[PDB]
Each structure stands twice: as C-alpha cells, then as structure tokens.
C-alpha cells in the first residue's frame, strides 16, 4: 500500500543480514555523522541517496522492485576516535550501472551523498569493482607487458623527465631540451600537465619539433625513445586532433590529464589509443583536491581503480620520498591494485576489499615529484621494475645540462639494478651503492654533490 | 494610433491595398497592359486562393502559385473590352472563383502585370 | 649565470609590490602550512608549482622570461581562528592559459599544489577570470534571456521535477510518470543524474517514451514542456549519439553531469547544443566531494564560474532550506556570479574579487533537493524569478499522484508570485500565503498536510 | 483522492493556476510592473491561442509564441490606469481575442512579466 | 605607382567569352518574381532598426509586425551577423516563425533576408 | 556605350541573369513617386527608418509604404506623370489611408540635397 | 517616450565627456564635412550610422539600451588648414562585434558612412583593437619566432624573388626559373599575385614543377628553400 510521508531510511536501506553477491559493487565509506544521527540511519541515508531512494515515500517504488535495485548498507564498523566515525559498507546491484562508464559509476556512488546536512564529513575509502563489471571495460589501451614488448625495454624501471619551466618555453626550445634529455639515457621526456596549446607555444609546433628530437636521439643512442605529447584539450574535437597528429608522426606515446579532462574524454582517448597503437600516459592533476584529507573526499585508490577501468598505460602514483604527500604502505597497496590481477583484502595497506581484475591489463605506476639521484635505491625498492621514475628538476637542474643530467639518472638506476640483482639490500646499502657508482661516472658525481642533503620530511 | 487588424485582411498582391477597383479602373489596367505590348491572360482558382506548403517545404517551393488558365493567352488582342468580355464569361461560369488578369512579356519571358479581377464573397 | 641547486621559492615567487594586470587570472587560496613553513614561502611554493617553477634551479629558465610568465604570490592576508591559516593571493599571466579551455585553467591552478608535503591543507576560494580570457569561451549555449524567449515563459521561477525512484523504472513507466507530472503544471521533468543507459532502462527507449509524454502533456495544457534527457555517457561518441537523437525528436532540452562527465566532454556538448538549438541543464554531481570542507578543496563558486565558461543554460545551485548543505549569503553570492554581467567584490558573500563577464550569457540557478510546498515562499524570496525550482519527492510523493503533485507546486509558486507582486513580504508572510492558497486548492491542501513539520536544520 | 481533468484545463502561463484575476488584482500586477521600471505592452491573438508546430519541428522552434502587438509598448507611462484603459479598448475592438499584458526590461532585454488579461468565452 | 598622383578605374568591358565562365546570379529577376509570385510593381523591403542591440525575440517580433503590414521582405542589417546581444541561430529561428506567421495572415509570400 | 551615363563600353551579358537593384538609405513615403519613376518595376525599395519610425508602429508603417507604392503604380498605369504629379498622387492616397496620412505628416518634409 | 521624426545625430551620438573603456574599439576618422555641416553633427552622424542609429527615430530603441550599444563620437580634433577637416574619435562597445570576424568589424565601422551626402570625404586613419577582442582571433598561423625556427634561418632579413614576367610563363619554365633563383642563395621565390590558374599555366602543374625545383635547390645548397604557392 502507498502511504505518502517521510519514513526513516534505515527501514528500507539498512540490511545487516544481507549477503553480498559477487556481482555487487561494494563501497567502504568513512562516515562522520552530525550529533544525534545514529550510524544505522546515516549509513542507510548514504545507501538510499546513492541508489534508488529520496527524502519522502514515492508511489512509483511499487511499479518496480526495490529489493532488486536498492543500494544497501549491510555493515557498520565503529572506528577509533569520537567523532562517532564509522565505516559504512554499501552494496549496489550490478543493474544500477551503465556498462563501460566510469562516469556513471561515480555519478551514483559519489554524486550527492557528500553534501548531506545530516553528515559532517564523508570519505569513500575503497570500491570493490565486481569482475562482471570489469569485463564491460576496455581498460588500458596496452598495459605493462605490451608496452615493454613494444618499446623493447626489460629488466629495470623506465626513466622519464618533465621539461622545465612548466610554462614559458617555445616549441623549438622544447624540442632542444627533449633531444638533450633523450640522448643522455632517459627512455622518455614529457610535456608538463599544463602544457596544452598556449600563446608561448602552440601544440602542433611542439609536436613536430619533439618528433624531430625523438628521431634524432633514437638514431644517436640506438634505443627506442618517446616524448609524451599532451592531448589534453578544451574539447574532444581538439583532443582528438592532437592524438591524430601524434599518430601521423608515428610517435609511440601520448598523454592525458584524466581528472581535469574528465572520464568521458579519457575513455574516448583510451579507445582511440587502442585503435591506433598509441601508448597513453596519465597525469592525475587535481587528485589532491579530492584525496588529501583523511575525513572527507575519495582516497586515491578509488581514483586509481577508476583510471584502470577508463584506461591508461601509465598513471602517476606518487614517490613516497619526494616533494608531494604519499605514505609507503598505502602506496604499495594501490600499486598492487594498479598492476596485479588479484589483490586480497589487506587493511594494513588500506585495501578494504579483495579485487579481481579478470585479466584486465595492468597500469605502470609513475613516481614523479621532487626526486633526484639519492632517491634511486628507495624508488627501485618500493616500486620494482614495473614502474616509470620521472626526474624533471632532477635532470634539467644538473650543473652540466640535460644529457649529463640524463646520464646521471640512468647510471644511478642501472647501479641500483645491478646491486639488487647481486643480492644487495637497496633499503640498507642505498647511499653506498650511489657513492660507489660516483667513482666511474663524472655525470653522477656532479649530480650527487648538488643534491646531497636535499630531503622531503614533514 | 490605429491597430492594423490581424484578421479579415487577406491580400492578393499588386493593387490589393488600394480601395476595390471600379470597372473603369480595371479597364485602365488592361489598357496599360495592351499599350505596353503585353499579352493578356485570365487565370482562376476555386479551392485554394492563397499560397500554402503541403507537398514540400524546401526553399522557393510553395503550392498554390499556379491557378487554372482560362482558355489561352489572348495573342493578337488590341482591344481592352475583349479581355473584360472574357472576365464576365469566367465570373458567370464560376461565380465562386478567384480571378486574376495577367500580362506576358515574351522578350523577357516574365509576367509584367497581375491583379485580382474577382473573388468569392467569403474567404 | 646558472647556478644548480635548491633556492627558496619566495626569492622569485613572492612579489608583495606586484600590481595586478586586468589580463591576470587571480586566485584566493586559503593556505594551512606545516609548522615551521613561513607564509611567504608556502604562498610562493603555491605560485611556483601552479605556474613555471620546480623544486630545484633549471638552466632553461634563462631561455625564456620568468618575469613575463611566472605566477606570483602578491599578498598574504592572515586569517581568523585557524593556525597558521592565511589567504595567499596569486596572479597568473594570461599567456599561461589555453583559450576556451576550463580543463587547462584547472590543470595549472589546481593541478599539483594541493598535495604539497609543506602544507597541511589548501582551499581555492575564488578566481578572478579576466574579461580578456572570458572572451575566448562560448559560455552558455543560450542563457537566461534566450531560454525564456524560446520557452515563452516569463515572470516566475520555472518548475521542475526529478522522476523517482532514482533507478529501477522501465522506459514506459518513466514516460508515464513524466506525462502525469508535466500535465499538472510543471514546466519540466528530468532524468536523475545517474539515469544514463542501464539494463533496467536503455536510453533510446527512454528518449522515445519521454518525447511522447512531452508532446501529449504540451497539447493537453497549451504550455511548452520539456524533459531533460540525460546525454551523460561513458565516452563522447555515446554522449553525442544521445544529443543527436534528442535533436531528431525536436525536444527542447538535454542534460549533463559536468564534473563526472568532465570539462572536455561538457565543452563539446555545450558547442553541440549551441549549433543545434538545444537547452543544456547541468548537474553538479560530485561537487560536495571537492567543495564541502572549509579548510581543503575548491569552493563551489569556482566550480560555478568554470561551468559558466564551459557552458550550461541551468546549473544546480543548492536550496539553502533543503536536505543538502548551503548557507544563504554564500549562495546569493554565487547566484550573482552565475547570472549577472558584473559582480563587485563582497567578502560578506564570499566574493573575493570583482568579476566582469563581458556579456557572456547568464546561467539559470536550480534549487533542488528535499524541498516541498512550505519552502516555496523562502525559495521565491532567495532566488527571485530567474531560477528553476525542482521537486522530485515533493511531486511523486503527493498522496493523489503526479498531476495533483504538480498542481500543488504550481499553485504554491503562483500564490507566492502574486503575493510578492502585491507588496507582501515572502520572508514574513510565507506560511499565511500558502494557508490562504490551500482554501481554494484541494491539491495544495493535500500536499501541505503531508509535509507539515518536515524541515532540514543542522 | 481527486483526479486532475485531462480536458477543459488549458493554461496561459504565469498566474493561470490561480482563480481568475479581479480588476484590482490585474491593476496590482500593472502597478508592480511600473514600480519595477518595466515598460507595459499589450498583445492579442484571435486564431491560435496556444503553441503548435506546423512550419518546423526542430529544437526550440514553436509556432504561436508571437501574438499581435496592440499599438506600441507604452514608454513613458507612469499610471497603471492608462494600461487598463488600453486593455478595455482592445477587449471592445476584439471581444473574441486572447489578450496578454507584458512588461519589458530594456537593460537585460527580456520580458520580465506576462499574464493573460482576457480570453474568448470558449476555447 | 610613385609616377602617378591619382588613378580611378571608371569602367571594364567584360568580354562575353569571359562572362560565359561565370554562373552569375543564383536566380536573377524573372526566376525570383516567378518563385515569389510577385508581378507588376517594385518589391518592398525594410531593414530592422536599431542596426545593433536587439535580442533574437525582439528581432522576430519587429519582423512579423513589418511583414504583416504589406512589405514583401524584411532584412538583417549588414552589421547583423552573430553577436553577444543576439546569436545568429536564435535570430534565424525566431525570424522563420515571424515569416510563416505573417505569410499565413496576409496570404502573400514573405521573406526575411538572413 | 553611353558617356552621358558614364558607360565607356558596350557590355554584352550573353544571357547571364540580371540583378534586381535595391533602393535603400533615408527614404520615406514622399520619395515613392520619384523611386518608381527612376527604377521602375524591377527593383526593391527598402524602408528601415521609414517603417520602424512610423508613429503607429511597424504594421501601420508597412501599410503606409505599401499604399504609397500601389498608389504610384495605379497612377502611372492610368497615364499620370510620376515626375510631375508625385506629391498630388501621395496627397490623394492620404484621404483614404490613415496609415499613409500619419507617415506623410511625420516626413513632410525631410529632404537630402547637397 | 517614443516621438516619431528626425532629430540631430549629436543629441544621442556626440558625447564629449565619454570615458573610453579598455574593451571599446576606438576609431580615428579624418572627416571632411560639406559646408554648413558642423563637426559635432558630422562626427555624430559617423558614430550613429556605423553602429545603432538611423536617419529617423525608431520606437525599437526603447526595447534595448542605446547607452550600452551606441557608437559615440567622444572627441573632435581639427586639422590645420581650411576645408573644415577634423579627426573624429569614435568609440564602439565590444558587444557590437562578432568574435574572430574581421569581416564583421569592417562591415560596421566602414560599411556605409563613407557615402554620406553630408560629407565630402572620409578616411579611417587608425583603429584601437581592444585586447579583449584580439583574444578572439587566432592571428598568424605561425608568426616571426615560429617561422624562423621552422626554416632554421637566423640573424638576417630573408631573401625572396617574384618570378617574371607576371603572366605568360608555362609551368615547366616557372619551375626552371624557381630552381635557378633558389640555388643562388635566395631563401624564397614566389608566384606573382596575378598567377592563380590560367590557360597559359594551370595551378596543379605549377605546384608539382615548383616542388621539384624547391627540393633540387635545397639538396644542392644545404639550406631550407620555399616557393610561395
Ligand atoms: C582580493 C583582492 C585581490 C587584489 O588583487 C587586491 C585586493 C587585496 C585589494 C582585493 O581585495 C581586491 C579585488 C578586486 C575588487 C578587484 C581586482 O583585483 O580585480
Ligand atoms: O611537474 C611535476 C614535478 O616535476 P619534477 O620532476 O621537476 O618534480 C609533476 O606533476 C609531479 O610529479 C606531481 O604529480 P604526482 O603527485 O601526481 O606524481
Ligand atoms: O536527486 C535530487 C534530489 O531529488 P528530490 O527533489 O526528490 O530531493 C537532486 O539531483 C539533488 O537535488 C542534487 O543535489 P544538488 O542540487 O545540491 O546538486
Ligand atoms: O541600413 C541602411 C539604411 O537603412 P534606412 O532605410 O533606415 O535608411 C542601409 O545599409 C543603407 O541603404 C546603406 O547602403 P547603400 O547606400 O549601399 O544602399
């Protein structure tokens, strides 16, 4: 029977006896309710407004089956403090989601619930993507294995470098800086995230000069080279124009800022890259607006999973040791979520749910931001071989210029690789390995003297 | 300040904003047509006295521009009264018809004159 | 002379004597530094990272002119309460930005700086968009005047309704609920933000049944009707497929979730709507993930200005009185930023900068979320006529069904309009105006009885 | 539970869901218009009082939005009674017309107010 | 030319062999009169004023009022393209509504030069 | 060729369509006889200010211009000289057309002679 | 209130106390009025007819805001001598112009005013293009810096040559003249402005032979060459 009026959300949306299905999307929300709001009600309000419910009873609910479609808070987990904070576990049926659309998944789960007057704060900590939903996505255009096979690069992290200053360089100077970096031993150079097309440098001019630089440096060294060309644009038409020209140049890699560009544009680019053999590097510009605070927002692990579904070959994953925030255990947790096929629940690493990827390709994590030669052993140990280590300031800030800056980074990396392969502990013998390699590398010795004592500890 | 009515003011092109033409004013229009060396012709319509767009709506397409020809263009006619004799004949055969008198110029191949000569009582 | 090594950011990036240019983009950041970090250094680090600087001196700076391109912290304003909080005013030269690209503007200003280890928290409070930059954007596909002229609707707020339950209804039931709402006096109905294309209801089926409902209700009432058809999709190709079909049906309006869909896809859609005469309604799904907390994120006013540049005819702007968070004075401030041509600096309303829109069309603000008939006088007084007032639960929750639900909302609105026009105070005579309307409207009386004592105060 | 009729409930936008406006309520609407600094204007229609789509069906295209202007917008009018004098004049000249009173804001260039002031007996 | 103080091209004889390489008018006098069904008098037009500053709705309103009174045509001013005060597509649609309303009212073919 | 009319060369158009000339710019009802005489039937006569400047609005403005034109056409067809009987033709039309009478009083008399 | 009839242009269009905005397009017109026409009226007539005004009062002005849209003669600067010549400074609001359209800018500013019976002569001497309007244009496809960087040419003016006779050469002879010029040290050769596609030489034939000439001369000299096609 239809009865108009307001009822508690907990009556339909709190189901503590619910057995999650393998097809459900599960969400771990860290909820901070307003005083006087019971956790069962706050949890049920989250489940209701992110799925089928509204603030009053609607007669239309009877035309459908809420049992089949409703989001459900199935578990409330009180957390230390007070606060009166808890973890509300919410299960969403597979039928609620548009196949292959990260946009749709986020619209429902995180669309309105964060603005609830009845809450003080809300943070989405994790999402269990059901493997039946994973299968509706293309995921990375290539993934770890394919990328290594295409570039013929094995047995070590890849080396990159962001051209600096971020803005202000002309297309010709950009290509000059690119050639100098690449010829010194870096596998890649890249446009900064904000380098799109500007009065100081228009994109098409940059793309052709960078192609000249890639081909000159590749012929010189005998190793495959790339420069991530930014396709990020104001419109999809402009983004596709950029990717089309990179394709015409026969260049291997392109780049996109998935959050400022957006998921709709990212998914189009990821599909274009798959159809055209382009590697796709992903910048996470704006993530810290959303993922920095413990009490409100979305943890980066959710944004990382969303990127792997939408599609990217590389994604920025932090440095741990560099200028930007990132804790070791949490980082190792989301790096496995990015790379592996199966990741078991692990709360010590912030993994709330077991994640099955059903063979979706892995994403190469990228360490970038205030890193230099002395960080090499720690970076190699944390990430391992399936990673990209990026040095903007750490290359273009070398006293002898870009090519010696690139040699210093390449020697430091290869010294860590040989040392590790020989049974040495990178976590304990770090400084000694780099010190040793300084004796046969004047380029590395010059970098070591400039950056000795530069640390990022807060 | 007077308001132009948005109803009961259907028009018929050239001369339709002037007071209705007298038999003498009509004769003078035919005399001008003949003096100019144009060929008079009468056309009539019974069902759709105004332009409409039923069969197509592309630029320059309109239905209702063609009316029915009354006999043939009066080649060789030099006397205006003969044209008015034909008008009276159409009016008699079809009292509820809209009737136009048109004049052709064979050099430029265009109608150089066109004026309503009769209408039904209500439209 | 180039000297390798780390230097303080304040040496180049803190310029307290700088005179802002009318072409500069200005940013008001609420900064919370780590202990031991001086405000001048934290401010300069924000200016440097979001513009041209990096962590160490790069020789390439000398190939360009940093004076011309650098972002500059030109003022530090100490802040009440929070320690050691301050507002850092940053000026960015016009040359840093890609014309017509909100994506590029956000990538630089908000790209990396929020994750700085040297900061505890960062909130972007406002942006002064220079009128020379405003001119590079199309802005709304139509705007307030054009929309009212197209729909032939004047002298009152527009009335809308979201179909409920959010998810779970079939295409036929959706169209049935739509026709019943529209025939009762609502100008618009709408898909929920998360209704895109799902197993329970595929988009094309919804679009066809909703078009049948629009045309039936319009013929019945004699008033122009619309149903916002959701173009939000996984990719731009699906997004445009959905807008192309809406165009084929000859319907007046479509909708998009600009934040979950993303700026690149939103600007693409806004251009398509301008080329094809479609009105564009915008959902701000996910905004509270970014804009809720006072100490970190981006205030909605920045996201509102970004939408006006990218393009939309309507934007959700909060209710003040409804189920979701939103304070009166701050709301009135961003409503002026959305609608007006010129908005003077006003700190009491959170307007840090004078904003000139150089005739860019205005956006209609939308009040939606837990509102009902008793809120009508307060809604009419806060927003005035240039607004859309949306009642999901407040229509489909009426005891007599949708058409009486729509009559109740339309009678309540028109009763407030007539009362105001007659010289009555809506802020004081609110309840009396409604009770007077109940005497002659049985539909309104029935809604009033159900929702008496339903309030949202936290 | 009452059923909203699907016939005999044709509407005329703003104020049409309220009981019919009294001469005092109409005067007060005109007074608000003038107090706001808007320019009053009267518009009327005799044939098609409601929107329809005959000539085109593309988004935002509708026929029947434009009505006929009664004289000109009343620039300089400061007295509400002069607008009601014009209403009575249009009602007398066209008793079977739909009549609206509109108010223009020249700064924003939009009609800021519109309401039906007269209708024929049957529609 | 430095060697000249002034030069004015007064006329050009376009040879008929050169004339034949051009399409020339899309329609021309006769075809236009035949398409519009207008004969025996000059055609009557009107440019919408003020030159600039009117909204799309006001443009269409001025158009309908002019056309319904006996003018065969109305026209955008030469200045009127697409501007912040009035975007072209909005003008085109409201002017089409005005053309069709005025044509149905008078029974004579109407146009508005877009 | 006709040097009295500035035609330096004989021009052959080999059946390329003719263009309808448009008379526009500061014209009103009193100019109608002169315009009809100079241009003849194959022309467009445009009145911007001369329509939207009518005291009764656009539709009466358009009626005034249409009545003035048709009065000149009927007069010419009846054997009257538009170049000599111009003002008389217009004054005669004012007696039965209130729209034309209202236009005549506003522009009687505005001239452009330099 | 609307009052039909003719009024002086200076009443609405001459504003000597107007403060120009940074968004206005400003025009410096050298006006030569007819004798008996005051400069303030000739200036105002220029401002009116190039913006919103007409010869007679229109009621429609009241539906909009002329203050916001009108062109304005804000200053008169006489020219030494006596022909009545003066510089009329006219300000046009940014809203009058179509973004990224030079065609629209010229249509308003220089569209009709030069033919005024009330003037003997009129010359547009300069235009202040506001930087807000500049931003709506792409401008040069490349510009100075990009062009030099693309051609790898620095430290001197570039050298060009127009192929002669202007008309009459065949495509093969054109390419032959091109190769000979370029191989001797010129950076560029070019078609004359007259050379498009003609019976003596069709464009596609010229383009192919000139490309052969460019590549032969570039290989020979070791310097980048071009022929403006
Ligand atoms: C927020 C802020 C930024 C400044 O640049 C100067 C000042 C501190 C006075 C100010 O308070 C003023 C801003 C205003 C009104 C305009 C502007 O800047 O275009
Ligand atoms: O421009 C840089 C830093 O260059 P540098 O190498 O000179 O420090 C990157 O954007 C950061 O890595 C931040 O990104 P994230 O935190 O996402 O890796
Ligand atoms: O689903 C609803 C509420 O429906 P109901 O009308 O039943 O409450 C709206 O999309 C929210 O208002 C969005 O929040 P905001 O407008 O704050 O973005
Ligand atoms: O806007 C007008 C005049 O309008 P109005 O009818 O109000 O004077 C036209 O542009 C002129 O005819 C000038 O052009 P030309 O001299 O080239 O015809």
Author numbering:
A (entry chain A), C (entry chain B): 12 to 469
B (entry chain U), D (entry chain T): 1 to 123
E (entry chain C): 127 to 240
F (entry chain C): 356 to 469
G (entry chain D): 12 to 240
Authors' own words:
All the plant Rubisco structures investigated to date, as well as all but one of the algal and most of the bacterial Rubiscos are hexadecameric, with 8 large (L) subunits and 8 small (S) subunits arranged in two tetramers of L-S dimers with the active site located at an L-L interface, exposed to the solvent through a channel. Rubisco is activated by the addition of CO2 (carbamylation) to an active site lysine (residue 201 in the spinach and pea enzymes) which subsequently stabilizes the binding of a Mg2+ ion.
Like pea Rubisco without ABA, the electron density maps define the main chain and side chain atoms of the asymmetric unit comprised of 4 L and 4 S subunits along with 4 RuBP ligands. Because the enzyme was not activated prior to crystallization, the active site lysine is not carbamylated and Mg2+ is not present. In comparison to non-ABA containing crystals, unique density was identified in two L subunits adjacent to Tyr100 and review of the same regions in the other two L subunits confirmed smaller, but visible changes compared to the non-ABA containing maps. The binding sites are similar in each L subunit and are situated in an exterior crevice, remote from any dimer interface and more than 30 Å away from the catalytic site. Perhaps of significance, the site is close to the regulatory latch region and involves residues that immediately precede and follow the 90–97 loop region implicated in binding to Rubisco activase. It must be noted, however, that despite the obvious attributes of a good binding site and the clear presence of unique density in subunits A and B, the density is really only obvious in two of the four subunits, the fit of ABA to the density is not perfect and its B-factors are high compared to surrounding protein suggesting disorder in parts of the ligand. Only very subtle deviations in the main chain traces are evident suggesting that the presence of ABA does not cause a significant conformational change, at least at the lower occupancies in these crystals. Overall, the crystallographic data yields a negative result, showing that there is no high affinity-binding site for ABA on RuBP-bound Rubisco.
